[PDB]
Amino acid sequence: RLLRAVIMGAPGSGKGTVSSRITTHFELKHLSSGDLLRDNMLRGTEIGVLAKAFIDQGKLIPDDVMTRLALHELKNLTQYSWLLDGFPRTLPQAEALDRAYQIDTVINLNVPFEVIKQRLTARWIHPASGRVYNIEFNPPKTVGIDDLTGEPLIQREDDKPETVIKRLKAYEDQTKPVLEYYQKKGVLETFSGTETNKIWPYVYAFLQTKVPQR
Numbered sequence: 001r002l003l004r005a006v007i008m009g010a011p012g013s014g015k016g017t018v019s020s021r022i023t024t025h026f027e028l029k030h031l032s033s034g035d036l037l038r039d040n041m042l043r044g045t046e047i048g049v050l051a052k053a054f055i056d057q058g059k060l061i062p063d064d065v066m067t068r069l070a071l072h073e074l075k076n077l078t079q080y081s082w083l084l085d086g087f088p089r090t091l092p093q094a095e096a097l098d099r100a101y102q103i104d105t106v107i108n109l110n111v112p113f114e115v116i117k118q119r120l121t122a123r124w125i126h127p128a129s130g131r132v133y134n135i136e137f138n139p140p141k142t143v144g145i146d147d148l149t150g151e152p153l154i155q156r157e158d159d160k161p162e163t164v165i166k167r168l169k170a171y172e173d174q175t176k177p178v179l180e181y182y183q184k185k186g187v188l189e190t191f192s193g194t195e196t197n198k199i200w201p202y203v204y205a206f207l208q209t210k211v212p213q214r
């Protein structure tokens with residue numbers, strides 16, 4: 001039985017790293033909705049130009065548009081094991097997917113809000129030089145100050161707590177119904193933790209029972 005899987009996780013949860021590792025260790029196709037959108041935007045396809053119109057304005061792709069795009073990619077990939085990442089993002093997407101394919105495995109990375117928030121708000125910049133500081137991994141010698149110049153660091157808008165809080169609230173509003181949908185269907189597997197490297201072995205062992213290695 002070929003894998004018919006979805007992976008879910010908030011921004012900053014480590015889902016990107018886990019999906020990357022899944023793809024390197026297992027013989028499957030990684031189907032990232034963001035990659036698919038970007039391929040179409042790069043090539044200027046009909047759906048790519050429409051997607052660009054939304055993304056350039058910071059808008060979600062409408063459900064019907066996104067589902068049409070995703071199903072078209074899947075339609076010629078049924079000879080392969082699949083790992084859907086980024087789709088379904090919303091309950092209408094998940095219900096539309098359910099009318100097209102039987103999804104047998106949904107992985108969720110359950111990482112605490114405070115942990116995610118700290119990860120997503122950690123980046124500070126010295127604008128003139130472009131030097132990057134990460135409160136967790138390469139902090140400045142003096143809080144809030146550039147090491148070479150003594151000048152203030154700033155946060156880019158995407159990295160500020162106000163923006164991050166809104167982003168995580170949106171993710172929760174959109175995806176909590178999807179998680180509950182798959183929980184009810186009995187296909188949800190939840191991995192909880194605070195460090196990607198401590199979660200990955202358990203995801204790895206779980207998938208070892210479901211799809212061949214690469």
Ligand SMILES: Nc1ncnc2c1ncn2[C@@H]1O[C@H](COP(=O)(O)OP(=O)(O)OP(=O)(O)O)[C@@H](O)[C@H]1O
Pocket residue numbers: 011033034035037055058059060061062066086087088089090093
């Ligand atoms: N399944 C989807 N439904 C609706 N919009 C989507 C979907 N997947 C991607 N997008 C749009 O494409 C953008 C780029 O996708 P990508 O997965 O790279 O997002 P991202 O930069 O991680 O942002 P996000 O936090 O919104 O996922 C998203 O921000 C979103 O607007």
Ligand SMILES: [Cl-]
Pocket residue numbers: 010011012013014015016017
């Ligand atoms: Cl992530």
Ligand SMILES: [Cl-]
Pocket residue numbers: 027028029080081
């Ligand atoms: Cl494959």
Ligand SMILES: [Cl-]
Pocket residue numbers: 122123132133134
């Ligand atoms: Cl960083």
Ligand SMILES: [Mg+2]
Pocket residue numbers: 034086
């Ligand atoms: Mg994303």
Ligand SMILES: [Mg+2]
Pocket residue numbers: 138139
């Ligand atoms: Mg340093």
Ligand code: NA
Pocket residue numbers: 030031032035
């Ligand atoms: Na990809």
Ligand code: NA
Pocket residue numbers: 032034035
């Ligand atoms: Na990617």
